[PDB]
Amino acid sequence: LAAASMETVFPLPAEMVNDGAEYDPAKDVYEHQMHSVHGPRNAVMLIRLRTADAEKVIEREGQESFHYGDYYAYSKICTHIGCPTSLYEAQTNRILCPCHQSQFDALHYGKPVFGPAARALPQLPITVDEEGYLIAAGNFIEPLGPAFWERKS
Amino acid sequence: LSVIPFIWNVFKSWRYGELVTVDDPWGYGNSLEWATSCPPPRHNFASLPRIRSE
Amino acid sequence: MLASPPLDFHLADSYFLIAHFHYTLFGTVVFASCAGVYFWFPKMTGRMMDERLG
Amino acid sequence: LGGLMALLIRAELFTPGLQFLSNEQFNQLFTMHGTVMLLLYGTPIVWGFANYVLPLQIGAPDVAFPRLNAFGFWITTVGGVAMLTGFLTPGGAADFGWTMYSPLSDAI
Amino acid sequence: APPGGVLGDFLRMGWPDGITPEAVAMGNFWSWVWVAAWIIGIIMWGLFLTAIFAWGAKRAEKRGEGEFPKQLQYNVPLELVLTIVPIIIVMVLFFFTVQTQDKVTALDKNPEVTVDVTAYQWNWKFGYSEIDGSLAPGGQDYQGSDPERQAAAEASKKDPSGDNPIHGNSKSDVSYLEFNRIETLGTTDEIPVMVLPVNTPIEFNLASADVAHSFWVPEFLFKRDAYAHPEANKSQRVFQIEEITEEGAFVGRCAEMCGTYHAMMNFELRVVDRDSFAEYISFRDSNPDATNAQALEHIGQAPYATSTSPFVSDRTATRDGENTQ
Amino acid sequence: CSAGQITQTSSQVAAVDGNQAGSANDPVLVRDVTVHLTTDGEAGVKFTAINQDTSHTSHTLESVTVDGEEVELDDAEPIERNCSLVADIQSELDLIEEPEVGCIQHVATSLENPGFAYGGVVPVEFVFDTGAITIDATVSAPVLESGVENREV
Amino acid sequence: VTTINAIWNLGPYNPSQVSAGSQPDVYMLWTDGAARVMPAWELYLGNYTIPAVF
Amino acid sequence: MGKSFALLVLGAIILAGGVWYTIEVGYSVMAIVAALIMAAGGGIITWGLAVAADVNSPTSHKI
Amino acid sequence: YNFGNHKGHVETIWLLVITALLVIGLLIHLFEPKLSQVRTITSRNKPVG
Amino acid sequence: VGLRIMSAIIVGLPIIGTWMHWLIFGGDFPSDLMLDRFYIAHVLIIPAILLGLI
Amino acid sequence: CXXXXXXXXXXXXXXXXXXXX
Amino acid sequence: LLTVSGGNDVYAMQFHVSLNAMTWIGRIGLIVGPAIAYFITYRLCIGLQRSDRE
Amino acid sequence: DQALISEGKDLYDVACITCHGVNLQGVEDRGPSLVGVGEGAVYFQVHSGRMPILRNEAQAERKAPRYTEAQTLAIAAYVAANGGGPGLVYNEDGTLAMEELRGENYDGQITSADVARGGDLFRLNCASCHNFTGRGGALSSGKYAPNLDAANEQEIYQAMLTGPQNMPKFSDRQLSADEKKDIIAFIKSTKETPSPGGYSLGSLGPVAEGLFMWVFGILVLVAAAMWIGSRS
Ligand SMILES: CCCCCCCCCCCCCCCC(=O)O[C@H](COC(=O)CCCCCCC[C@@H](C)CCCCCCCCC)COP(=O)(O)O[C@H]1[C@H](O)[C@H](O)[C@@H](O)[C@@H](O)[C@@H]1O
Ligand code: HEC
Ligand code: HEC
Ligand SMILES: CCCCCCCCCCCCCC(=O)O[C@H](COC(=O)CCCCCCCCCCC)COP(=O)(O)O
Ligand SMILES: CCCCCCCCCCCCCC(=O)O[C@H](COC(=O)CCCCCCCCCCC)COP(=O)(O)O
Ligand SMILES: CCCCCCCCCCCCC
Ligand code: FES
Ligand SMILES: [Ca+2]
Ligand SMILES: [Cu+2]
Ligand SMILES: [Cu+2]
Ligand SMILES: [Mg+2]
């Protein structure tokens, strides 16, 4: 991933992998892997920020170690009505929701700066494996997607 | 800032401001439009005078 | 002055030109237009504009 | 409306340095100022003293083509609204003067 | 021949003293024209004032005057004479106009140095095309055109892929431009300085990369538009001066609307001694890797523009009036 | 309205990997600075030193230190004025050619590869004859040969 | 003579991918327009939430 | 004559205030505000002069 | 409208101007103002009657 | 995306918001029975009511 | 009115490096 | 206004207006648009009544 | 080549020097540094007629190109000599690939198996900013993702190789060569294929089908009703 790029990632567990050094053209994992891509709250957008921009980021309390150097991973599901917020602007560092026009700041832990969304985008902790692969270091702190009655402690 | 007296004058004197009770209020108007009422009828003329000069 | 090329070499596309066509535009289209408004206001409306404000 | 632009130009020129305007939005401020006063004020004030007084000065009941006369007013208004719509675009209005000097005023 | 001192200063209305015989002629013409204009204006205004102080409504009441006086409308002979007088005035003025304009527009001044001015958005670029053998590096007439750098432009005339819309030439045919060896290039943060000799006939060759600009030197009391493809537009791209009489640094501005940074492409003229200029040319000719500032330092001049400063490019700065570099 | 003093075009940056130092009133600039590390463990530094100092003084670069160990330069001549020192690994420097028109110097660099992580940030430090410039630079893989690179899978 | 709802251009539903605009039918636009112009007015009570959509 | 002199003095003091105010605020945004101040002052002065020059040669009578 | 997520004030200045115009209008509508007739005579104008 | 919007509108209702969503869709969105409840409401339930009212 | 838990924190900088030589 | 602002993304792109400006037009227009519509419509209705009486 | 840089810098010394600098280091508020952008970023910006910028605004526009193909490549050669990044994609010969980058398995026409995969890739990353079939979409504040009809295949490749303004950069490691070619296949297939049934109303969707009916469709039927019925 080059600096100022965004990529959608999905929760691929260890035993559903078929690619890599140990690939047998016999194992069938397509049906399982389709479950992760089709999960309501599974999609996560992984942003690599420029090194100049990563020094201007303000982290939320309790989510300061959730980044790997220049990689930040936010939940892709909008905190308004659960549309996928995927319009990542490379220079303004805002993520725009196509559905209703919410702008989430990428340098302010996903805090909205326009539109009907009121709560910031949840952040996923990430790290790198011993083999050299990007992995999830933990679960989200908070429920994903739109709000509901009995949501926020 | 000239616009201020001008706008106030036009707005105020449109509704209020002295009634003209004469055909030609400037006195010595010398063109056909000073031969009608102020304002003129819909069709500009309730009569025409004899035109012999400018 | 602008109509002579020896003089218009230095004066073209300067603020001397800007000053010129504001004496002629603001001259005709503003002074004479306002004159026309004060002149014809009784004719157009049947009322007279304030002299002091004018 | 055209004056409000001349004052903004004139305020910026008070002292050296760009206090509140930029080059782009200063350039599109005299383009539109010089336009709305020749074509939206000047010419549209010539035909008003003409439309009012000329029938009254020759002894006419009406103009020759009254219904065409009413069209001349409405097309001018539409043109005026159209040219000022430039300010409602993010980039702004035209910024080339009131003269469209070429090739400054082309696709490129 | 300006009229007197302080009065002559008043008549100029901030007209620069002028550093060129052309400028001197134009200045004199301007002063005299203003003398006549002031007279005419005074007469016209005088009549407008007497209309207030002499011909009044109840001014003409003390004398038992009534209303409606004279009522004259046609003084025929006065009308004819007051038609003729402006005709005579404009004709005698036009004679001097055409007399004066011939000096500047003449192209037979036998220049001893030619400069290729190239205006682009948004700066200037000067190059010494020809220099007379007198004030030349070795003595042989300097010939400043680049062999392969110009021939590369001459080859831009046709698009290798089919694209010759404009009279069977490429849309982007940059061949009217002239590329030289000794070139001063103006950056957004370095004002281009064109070094010229004193008491020498200079020629200027004007062209534009993209859009119409204007080479204006207030001290020259002269400007000229530089047009892309000046030949097609049928505009004379060349003007000459007899000599420059003064020595020092003189501003120059772009006096033609050309996009955004129009107010921000200023150049300087550094007029230096004859010998000094020759030395300058020698140094910059034998040192093609050197810079204009270094060459200026070589001849004991200030390395940078003194009459102008670069603008600070930061938009949200300059709010406090600090717009210089 | 979008053409004010703060615009969304003027404020844009290089859209490349690795940041820069010095803007206007700085004698020496560095542009596009990263720590390149080839897939198969070959390291180096990419940068470009521009000497734009108005008082012609001919800055020369003594050394480059990424974190703890120096970099093998190639006896580059001092940067005179309006010149440029383009440096990269030799493998990625054979793709481009030295111009004879301006004054641009191509220099190859190398490291010991102590253990830099892709996506991490490290404090590169340039030491010239007069002064030092310290900037955080990202660690990234060099750009691939465009249009030839398929997936193993 | 006219195309409506060209479903082949759009693919199968996927919760992770989306398009620009993505409006409902014309008769449903007023409801979707209501959601856009309503500001972020969430009420956070004690351990509860009223969304801004409410 | 009554209204006049009052307007002249008020305009004069405002204008003086503006002229003084320009000198502190060098080339800032507030220079524009000070320009507005002096413009208002000058406006009031000319208003006073105009009312002075109207009660000298009136063209309208109070019925 | 001034309470929500927006950092810009180019929309605040737009809200306050419109609100001011609306307030001015509603005050005019409430305290219905009237003016006097200008009982003057200009030049060769005749008094009413 | 329209269904996603609609489901997330319902789920956010103050009290009966998450209980209502599970009653309509038969669980989390998307669900197996959702397009069967939508189909029957569309071919029978609503057109019956509509035809009757018409 | 304001999100109860969305709160910025005070923090400056951190560093990282890979392993296995 | 609700319908247009529900689909102001397609309006913004095709007609070159700021999307934020569109949102604010929707927000403010829902207060000012109805008011102007009422005023104009009322006056025009009375105007049509007057033309009938003439 | 050397003459390429020579003539490539000459065009740059009279066009790209105001809002860029002499040593391509950038200006305060005029433009970034062109160091490391590559030979493929100059091609996209110059050839597509996007450069040079004429005024600062929300977003630079595509317009009429200022330079030809050869001139573009000369400027690109000069720029890449100041530290190179992404380069142009070539084919079997030293020619810029155009119709060859219309699918991985492209021979003489687009394979239907390439558009299927390219469609899903396109939908996943670029259906948001653009439309479903690359019709364009709006962004934050005066910005937008342009309609894709005007770009050739080399421009598409270089667009997602570099990241023009607010477009993210998609390196070859992220989206491989084959994936990029599939995306191009889908883009060029959806553009050049007429609608199976009807006159596709600019492919905008429910907003364009509702304007054709609610404003124009009903008007014709009103005119029919006004013709059959009476006015009294
Ligand atoms: C049927 C006829 C229809 C006629 C309707 C015509 C009325 C439309 C008015 C349009 C005004 C638009 C002006 C644009 C203003 C704009 O763009 O600002 C925006 C915020 O928009 C606003 O608040 C303006 C909203 C207020 C509009 C009020 C509209 C009410 C209408 C309905 C009533 C009036 C007309 C009545 C006519 C009725 C006719 C009968 C008489 C925010 O700027 P932003 O996108 O963030 O971008 C910048 C960065 O790029 C950059 O960095 C910069 O630094 C940033 O600061 C930022 O500005
Ligand atoms: C104001 C004048 C201006 C001129 C003239 C100009 N540029 Fe730029 N350039 C910009 C600005 C501003 C950007 C910011 C990004 C954008 O808007 O695309 C830019 C961006 C670029 C980029 C994208 C680099 C990146 O990845 O961030 C390239 C390549 C580029 N310019 C090359 C050129 C070339 C080649 C010319 C040739 C004449 C040129 N420019 C002339 C202002 C200008
Ligand atoms: C904002 C999010 C965004 C995403 C995600 C995105 N783009 Fe873009 N795209 C843009 C913007 C903004 C521009 C205009 C930049 C410019 O022209 O300076 C653009 C420009 C382009 C251009 C140049 C357009 C033209 O008409 O010449 C092409 C081609 C393009 N994109 C294709 C793609 C492809 C192919 C993908 C993904 C597989 C993609 N885009 C993903 C926003 C996006
Ligand atoms: C009502 C008109 C009043 C006329 C006042 C005339 C004042 C100008 C004096 C002329 C001095 C000539 C000096 C000279 O040779 O300079 C030359 C010519 O000067 C002029 O342009 C004078 C033109 C004056 C306007 C024409 C009005 C004449 C009215 C007819 C009555 C004679 C210029 O000097 P130069 O060539 O640069 O060396
Ligand atoms: C019912 C409300 C309808 C709205 C109509 C719109 C017109 C609003 C214009 C308000 C004008 C005020 C009328 C007025 O005062 O005129 C008259 C006084 O004259 C002036 O205003 C001249 C001064 C103008 C220039 C100097 C300004 C210096 C102060 C600095 C201000 C920043 C009012 O007195 P009057 O009773 O009409 O004789
Ligand atoms: C909920 C609708 C109430 C209608 C109120 C009418 C107010 C409009 C008046 C605006 C025009 C001023 C005369
Ligand atoms: S769903 Fe993302 S803002 Fe409405
Ligand atoms: Ca200023
Ligand atoms: Cu210029
Ligand atoms: Cu210029
Ligand atoms: Mg000119």
Side-chain angles (χ1 to χ4, degrees):
Chain A
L1 200 66
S5 320
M6 192 276 288
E7 183 164 18
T8 307
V9 298
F10 304 97
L12 171 76
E15 53 267 30
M16 289 165 60
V17 305
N18 191 31
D19 72 272
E22 52 283 359
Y23 158 81
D24 54 334
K27 191 182 173 195
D28 195 355
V29 288
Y30 192 94
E31 296 82 3
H32 305 316
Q33 279 173 354
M34 282 311 280
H35 280 173
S36 50
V37 304
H38 269 82
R41 291 167 293 276
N42 286 347
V44 161
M45 70 209 297
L46 175 71
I47 299 104
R48 185 171 184 184
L49 270 80
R50 262 178 304 260
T51 187
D53 297 16
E55 299 188 313
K56 300 190 296 178
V57 184
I58 309 184
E59 299 96 350
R60 184 143 77 154
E61 183 187 325
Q63 334 177 316
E64 281 154 324
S65 48
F66 277 28
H67 66 96
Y68 183 86
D70 275 355
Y71 293 84
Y72 289 78
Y74 295 103
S75 193
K76 206 184 164 157
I77 323 299
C78 190
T79 77
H80 177 232
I81 308 182
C83 194
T85 64
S86 51
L87 278 69
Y88 168 67
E89 303 185 342
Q91 294 270 347
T92 75
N93 277 308
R94 265 178 273 149
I95 305 111
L96 181 76
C97 186
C99 282
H100 318 83
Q101 291 74 238
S102 311
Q103 281 106 308
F104 304 93
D105 204 8
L107 310 165
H108 211 267
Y109 58 79
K111 195 176 162 292
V113 293
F114 202 85
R119 296 173 300 101
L121 270 195
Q123 188 185 355
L124 174 80
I126 60 165
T127 188
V128 170
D129 215 0
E130 308 310 311
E131 276 191 297
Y133 289 102
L134 264 166
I135 72 156
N139 192 229
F140 293 98
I141 286 304
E142 63 174 13
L144 309 183
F148 48 96
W149 170 244
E150 56 283 57
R151 192 255 187 213
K152 187 184 60 46
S153 178
Chain B
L1 292 183
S2 304
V3 70
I4 285 162
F6 179 71
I7 294 172
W8 178 242
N9 206 351
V10 163
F11 175 90
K12 166 178 157 77
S13 59
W14 173 280
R15 279 80 178 273
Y16 315 104
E18 94 195 20
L19 300 176
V20 57
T21 62
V22 65
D23 264 355
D24 179 29
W26 297 120
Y28 320 85
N30 53 28
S31 161
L32 204 54
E33 56 168 353
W34 306 109
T36 76
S37 57
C38 302
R42 165 70 173 94
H43 293 304
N44 292 340
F45 287 97
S47 52
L48 283 167
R50 279 186 284 103
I51 299 152
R52 287 312 180 245
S53 71
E54 53 270 8
Chain C
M1 291 164 186
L2 288 168
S4 52
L7 260 52
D8 191 39
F9 291 151
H10 185 46
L11 298 173
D13 205 78
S14 87
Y15 253 69
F16 182 93
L17 170 66
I18 299 286
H20 152 87
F21 70 69
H22 282 100
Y23 268 69
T24 55
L25 274 173
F26 206 104
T28 64
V29 183
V30 184
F31 273 94
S33 164
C34 283
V37 166
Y38 284 92
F39 187 52
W40 278 310
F41 203 83
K43 189 48 65 173
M44 308 174 67
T45 198
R47 318 225 172 209
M48 278 262 189
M49 292 180 72
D50 190 300
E51 290 286 308
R52 182 193 290 267
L53 265 162
Chain D
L1 179 66
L4 175 60
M5 302 165 166
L7 296 181
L8 289 163
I9 283 157
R10 186 74 265 175
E12 188 54 82
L13 277 161
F14 189 64
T15 51
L18 286 155
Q19 271 78 38
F20 70 103
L21 280 179
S22 75
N23 296 274
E24 289 76 74
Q25 64 178 21
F26 180 95
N27 296 354
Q28 74 199 19
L29 207 55
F30 58 70
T31 287
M32 291 319 283
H33 154 79
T35 313
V36 306
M37 285 183 177
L38 296 165
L39 311 168
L40 284 192
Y41 165 62
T43 303
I45 201 60
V46 156
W47 307 115
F49 293 111
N51 286 162
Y52 201 90
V53 182
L54 186 140
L56 278 163
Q57 267 190 335
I58 58 180
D62 214 353
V63 291
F65 310 108
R67 202 171 56 167
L68 177 72
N69 193 28
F71 167 73
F73 165 80
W74 286 109
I75 186 64
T76 308
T77 301
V78 161
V81 164
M83 58 163 86
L84 287 160
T85 317
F87 283 117
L88 306 181
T89 55
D95 47 358
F96 62 72
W98 81 279
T99 49
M100 286 183 78
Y101 265 36
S102 283
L104 169 66
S105 67
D106 59 4
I108 200 165
Chain E
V6 55
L7 171 73
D9 190 16
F10 159 67
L11 290 158
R12 289 189 77 81
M13 295 171 75
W15 213 249
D17 273 6
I19 64 167
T20 315
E22 283 75 3
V24 169
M26 295 195 255
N28 305 325
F29 184 39
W30 161 269
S31 302
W32 290 114
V33 161
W34 257 120
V35 163
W38 277 126
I39 287 182
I40 282 167
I42 278 163
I43 301 321
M44 286 292 73
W45 284 320
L47 285 175
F48 298 157
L49 276 175
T50 196
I52 303 166
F53 298 124
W55 315 313
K58 72 188 179 287
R59 170 64 62 197
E61 285 300 332
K62 278 83 185 175
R63 294 185 289 179
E65 185 63 26
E67 49 264 59
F68 321 125
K70 214 345 144 180
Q71 290 272 338
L72 181 77
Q73 187 174 6
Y74 287 107
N75 194 336
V76 167
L78 183 133
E79 273 156 304
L80 293 199
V81 70
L82 274 190
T83 289
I84 299 309
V85 161
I87 293 283
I88 290 172
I89 289 171
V90 298
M91 288 172 81
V92 66
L93 194 148
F94 173 73
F95 173 85
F96 291 122
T97 288
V98 62
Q99 185 169 98
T100 300
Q101 88 183 344
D102 186 74
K103 303 293 186 72
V104 299
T105 58
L107 287 200
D108 57 346
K109 300 190 183 73
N110 292 333
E112 293 178 14
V113 55
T114 302
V115 183
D116 298 322
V117 191
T118 297
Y120 68 92
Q121 281 180 326
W122 292 265
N123 227 325
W124 300 89
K125 162 173 155 280
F126 310 106
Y128 297 78
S129 183
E130 284 92 349
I131 306 166
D132 181 44
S134 171
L135 67 161
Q140 297 306 317
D141 314 343
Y142 185 72
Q143 186 63 254
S145 59
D146 278 336
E148 71 280 359
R149 212 153 69 84
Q150 174 88 75
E154 198 72 29
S156 84
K157 191 175 284 173
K158 306 268 173 174
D159 192 338
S161 299
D163 184 77
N164 311 302
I166 299 92
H167 307 304
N169 285 334
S170 179
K171 186 159 183 75
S172 81
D173 166 29
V174 292
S175 65
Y176 59 95
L177 293 169
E178 186 179 356
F179 298 90
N180 291 354
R181 266 193 297 282
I182 308 168
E183 272 176 343
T184 311
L185 183 81
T187 321
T188 189
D189 52 15
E190 202 259 340
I191 294 301
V193 168
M194 182 176 71
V195 178
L196 293 182
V198 72
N199 301 113
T200 300
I202 299 97
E203 181 180 2
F204 304 85
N205 199 297
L206 276 73
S208 175
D210 44 4
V211 185
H213 298 259
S214 198
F215 185 93
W216 186 22
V217 184
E219 288 292 319
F220 277 5
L221 300 174
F222 186 91
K223 83 179 59 71
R224 171 76 68 89
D225 285 18
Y227 283 84
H229 305 87
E231 304 90 19
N233 300 345
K234 296 177 288 167
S235 82
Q236 182 84 253
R237 72 188 265 160
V238 158
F239 76 93
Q240 315 181 5
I241 65 175
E242 286 181 2
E243 80 192 16
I244 299 184
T245 56
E246 293 285 311
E247 206 173 348
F250 313 110
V251 74
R253 296 182 174 91
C254 180
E256 180 55 74
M257 179 64 190
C258 48
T260 68
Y261 308 109
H262 158 62
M264 280 152 180
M265 48 179 294
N266 303 3
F267 56 95
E268 200 198 79
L269 267 75
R270 193 76 55 93
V271 177
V272 298
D273 199 351
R274 297 203 72 254
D275 299 326
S276 179
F277 172 77
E279 206 285 343
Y280 165 91
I281 285 305
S282 181
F283 169 84
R284 198 150 173 218
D285 171 47
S286 74
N287 296 62
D289 210 8
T291 191
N292 183 37
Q294 269 172 277
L296 273 161
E297 287 169 16
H298 188 100
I299 58 172
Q301 293 291 322
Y304 302 105
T306 66
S307 53
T308 313
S309 285
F311 285 82
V312 291
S313 46
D314 199 287
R315 294 158 75 80
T316 189
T318 77
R319 291 206 179 124
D320 295 329
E322 302 295 325
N323 56 338
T324 51
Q325 279 194 37
Chain F
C1 181
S2 303
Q5 275 176 355
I6 296 128
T7 63
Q8 311 193 67
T9 45
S10 53
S11 50
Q12 299 211 11
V13 289
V16 295
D17 305 324
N19 49 348
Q20 70 268 38
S23 278
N25 290 328
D26 293 328
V28 186
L29 312 179
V30 289
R31 292 312 193 245
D32 172 52
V33 184
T34 188
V35 179
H36 283 292
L37 182 67
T38 304
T39 297
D40 49 282
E42 180 195 349
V45 186
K46 190 191 193 196
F47 64 92
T48 306
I50 296 93
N51 191 29
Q52 65 156 5
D53 190 65
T54 60
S55 168
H56 325 76
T57 195
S58 77
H59 286 108
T60 175
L61 189 150
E62 297 290 284
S63 64
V64 181
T65 302
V66 170
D67 210 340
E69 286 90 6
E70 294 73 23
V71 174
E72 283 96 359
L73 273 300
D74 295 327
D75 59 281
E77 272 75 3
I79 321 164
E80 282 305 320
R81 229 271 255 190
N82 284 343
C83 282
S84 277
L85 198 153
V86 180
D88 204 343
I89 62 182
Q90 175 73 319
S91 72
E92 288 279 308
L93 201 61
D94 297 334
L95 298 172
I96 66 180
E97 202 162 332
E98 269 207 2
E100 298 152 324
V101 280
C103 56
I104 298 154
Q105 189 160 233
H106 287 197
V107 183
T109 53
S110 80
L111 274 70
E112 197 62 38
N113 191 14
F116 295 138
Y118 289 126
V121 183
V122 288
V124 187
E125 165 178 21
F126 307 76
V127 167
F128 298 84
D129 74 12
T130 53
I133 310 169
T134 299
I135 43 154
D136 293 332
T138 191
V139 182
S140 47
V143 176
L144 269 166
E145 182 70 23
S146 67
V148 304
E149 185 73 15
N150 292 347
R151 280 196 204 273
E152 179 283 334
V153 72
Chain G
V1 170
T2 57
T3 309
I4 193 170
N5 197 10
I7 65 159
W8 50 90
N9 278 335
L10 304 23
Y13 174 60
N14 188 336
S16 53
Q17 69 200 18
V18 75
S19 175
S22 69
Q23 283 100 18
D25 280 340
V26 54
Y27 39 83
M28 284 273 103
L29 282 182
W30 66 291
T31 65
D32 192 68
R36 307 191 183 202
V37 303
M38 194 55 72
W41 288 338
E42 284 195 33
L43 260 167
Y44 318 96
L45 302 180
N47 197 9
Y48 296 134
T49 306
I50 306 285
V53 201
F54 171 62
Chain H
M1 292 300 100
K3 193 178 185 188
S4 163
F5 291 134
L7 275 177
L8 271 85
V9 296
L10 191 145
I13 63 151
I14 285 185
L15 169 65
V19 170
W20 184 82
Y21 181 51
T22 42
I23 312 167
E24 296 83 8
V25 292
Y27 283 168
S28 65
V29 189
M30 300 320 280
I32 293 152
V33 169
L36 290 171
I37 302 299
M38 304 184 276
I44 290 157
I45 295 166
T46 61
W47 170 21
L49 291 173
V51 302
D54 165 57
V55 297
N56 175 266
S57 67
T59 47
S60 54
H61 301 335
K62 299 298 293 180
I63 201 56
Chain I
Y1 277 151
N2 286 307
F3 312 103
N5 308 123
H6 58 266
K7 301 290 93 173
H9 294 94
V10 81
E11 57 258 14
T12 290
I13 192 157
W14 258 96
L15 283 156
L16 289 182
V17 156
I18 288 186
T19 300
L21 275 182
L22 196 54
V23 159
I24 286 298
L26 281 152
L27 257 57
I28 285 180
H29 181 269
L30 184 71
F31 306 111
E32 279 186 350
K34 306 300 181 180
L35 263 297
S36 302
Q37 185 67 55
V38 173
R39 285 191 110 243
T40 53
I41 292 142
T42 314
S43 75
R44 297 295 173 190
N45 185 58
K46 306 294 190 73
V48 179
Chain J
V1 180
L3 280 176
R4 179 64 191 169
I5 279 164
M6 168 222 170
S7 86
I9 280 180
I10 292 174
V11 70
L13 281 180
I15 309 155
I16 52 101
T18 59
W19 278 85
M20 254 213 54
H21 180 278
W22 264 249
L23 182 140
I24 293 175
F25 292 84
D28 203 16
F29 170 91
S31 62
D32 289 331
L33 296 186
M34 163 193 60
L35 293 176
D36 294 300
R37 301 186 159 153
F38 274 73
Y39 177 81
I40 193 62
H42 177 76
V43 300
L44 176 76
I45 305 305
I46 290 190
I49 301 173
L50 219 57
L51 186 66
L53 274 178
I54 285 176
Chain K
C1 303
Chain L
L1 276 168
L2 281 185
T3 308
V4 167
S5 62
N8 53 0
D9 304 273
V10 166
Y11 192 97
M13 189 267 292
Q14 301 284 16
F15 293 106
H16 269 89
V17 70
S18 183
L19 181 50
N20 295 5
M22 274 312 278
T23 311
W24 278 110
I25 282 161
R27 271 180 196 160
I28 295 174
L30 281 185
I31 281 149
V32 172
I36 298 164
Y38 182 95
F39 168 76
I40 292 177
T41 308
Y42 201 104
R43 294 307 174 109
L44 277 171
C45 281
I46 313 307
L48 281 170
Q49 294 181 9
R50 292 258 189 214
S51 80
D52 276 350
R53 298 314 189 279
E54 290 297 328
Chain M
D1 212 351
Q2 286 298 319
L4 200 63
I5 293 163
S6 170
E7 183 282 333
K9 109 167 267 284
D10 287 347
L11 296 181
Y12 169 97
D13 263 13
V14 82
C16 349
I17 183 158
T18 291
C19 301
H20 269 329
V22 164
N23 285 102
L24 293 85
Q25 71 263 28
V27 206
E28 207 20 67
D29 273 341
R30 302 230 163 145
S33 74
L34 287 196
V35 169
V37 295
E39 202 177 310
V42 169
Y43 172 87
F44 171 84
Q45 291 290 325
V46 177
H47 183 264
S48 80
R50 231 163 226 80
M51 279 312 126
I53 291 217
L54 259 314
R55 55 159 205 190
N56 292 101
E57 65 190 75
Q59 162 154 337
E61 298 284 316
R62 164 175 282 236
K63 63 208 173 192
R66 157 75 169 114
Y67 295 105
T68 78
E69 186 67 32
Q71 290 176 321
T72 296
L73 296 188
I75 305 177
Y78 169 59
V79 160
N82 294 258
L88 299 166
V89 49
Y90 299 97
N91 49 18
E92 258 318 302
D93 282 353
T95 60
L96 293 174
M98 216 70 40
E99 70 142 9
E100 307 73 359
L101 257 64
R102 262 194 198 218
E104 182 180 4
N105 310 118
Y106 177 96
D107 61 354
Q109 66 168 320
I110 310 176
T111 302
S112 276
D114 290 327
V115 299
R117 174 156 177 273
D120 190 74
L121 278 162
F122 184 92
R123 274 192 292 277
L124 168 62
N125 290 335
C126 50
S128 55
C129 282
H130 314 266
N131 194 237
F132 285 105
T133 57
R135 297 290 105 209
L139 263 75
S140 290
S141 61
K143 308 177 299 268
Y144 59 97
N147 172 299
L148 259 47
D149 280 27
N152 54 34
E153 305 83 337
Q154 185 75 30
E155 267 159 37
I156 300 169
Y157 206 100
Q158 298 309 318
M160 66 177 156
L161 209 42
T162 68
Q165 293 176 153
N166 288 312
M167 187 176 176
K169 185 191 287 213
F170 307 89
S171 77
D172 282 336
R173 287 166 210 278
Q174 185 180 347
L175 279 160
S176 49
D178 55 8
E179 297 190 3
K180 284 188 160 126
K181 283 161 180 145
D182 291 355
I183 286 162
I184 298 176
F186 172 76
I187 284 169
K188 283 304 178 168
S189 166
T190 53
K191 161 197 176 181
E192 295 181 10
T193 313
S195 202
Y199 143 71
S200 70
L201 285 92
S203 307
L204 279 197
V207 71
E209 299 146 7
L211 182 73
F212 177 85
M213 190 65 211
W214 279 39
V215 171
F216 298 123
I218 197 62
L219 213 68
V220 182
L221 290 182
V222 158
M226 289 179 69
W227 171 47
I228 303 175
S230 82
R231 292 283 306 261
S232 72

